Amino acid sequence: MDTGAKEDEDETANFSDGVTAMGFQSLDTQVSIKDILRRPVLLFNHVELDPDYTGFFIPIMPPSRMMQYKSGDKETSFQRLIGRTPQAAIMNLFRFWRGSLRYTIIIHSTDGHPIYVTHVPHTGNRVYGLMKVNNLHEYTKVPIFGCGLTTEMIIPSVNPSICVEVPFDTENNWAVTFDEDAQRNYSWRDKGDTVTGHLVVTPVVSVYMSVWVEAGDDFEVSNFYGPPSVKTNDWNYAFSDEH
């Protein structure tokens, strides 16, 4: 970051700076970057889990322009307004992040079936949604949650929601927030450095889920990039105060 007061050489008289409005309305300050990143963002809104697959993959990365919808492109399972959230706009300014993320997963059920959430560390790939690992047609005898990796279970009859905190299990000092083109086929090891692992949800029977994401307490951002080129048309969908 460069403040730019360096370039301001003028030292002539000016009007008063006044008094801040911070604290006047309430003490609930919402200016802290970490506080903004720690409140949740909806990734997946009522998406299906299918037991024919290994599970629904969630790549461990914060919300950003990487998950932004553009009118015309192919339809994904992602929430369309991820790119327009405050924290996504903030993450578009910082290309480095380190620490844990927290995932709030809600299973749309009240059944006694256990739904397992398995953490995969940084393996070098980057996938999302339902996937058959090594293209098999049977995963009940070889579940991902019973392979050895760290796992937690949801029992909807007790509690359909859970909040799980995924560690920074990677080789790199920082995780890369975004690329210029997310679908470009470049150097394969660099391609996978935008995630720190995966979170895999596996059901017993067919059931829907919703997924939110936020930053952990142990979390930092760095490598300030400044604001990008942007567009808006908010004016057009509202009346003015003069009819």
Binding site: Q183, R184, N185, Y186, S187
Partner: peptide, 26 residues
């Protein structure tokens, strides 16, 4: 095919990114 996969030869280097020589990208 998907045109995002590979960058055209005239604007790019061997590592599949915009060349430093190619100033017109902006």
């Amino acid at each position: 095919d998907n045109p995002h996969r590979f960058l055209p030869a005239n604007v790019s280097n061997r590592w599949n990114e915009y060349s430093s020589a190619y100033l017109p990208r902006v």
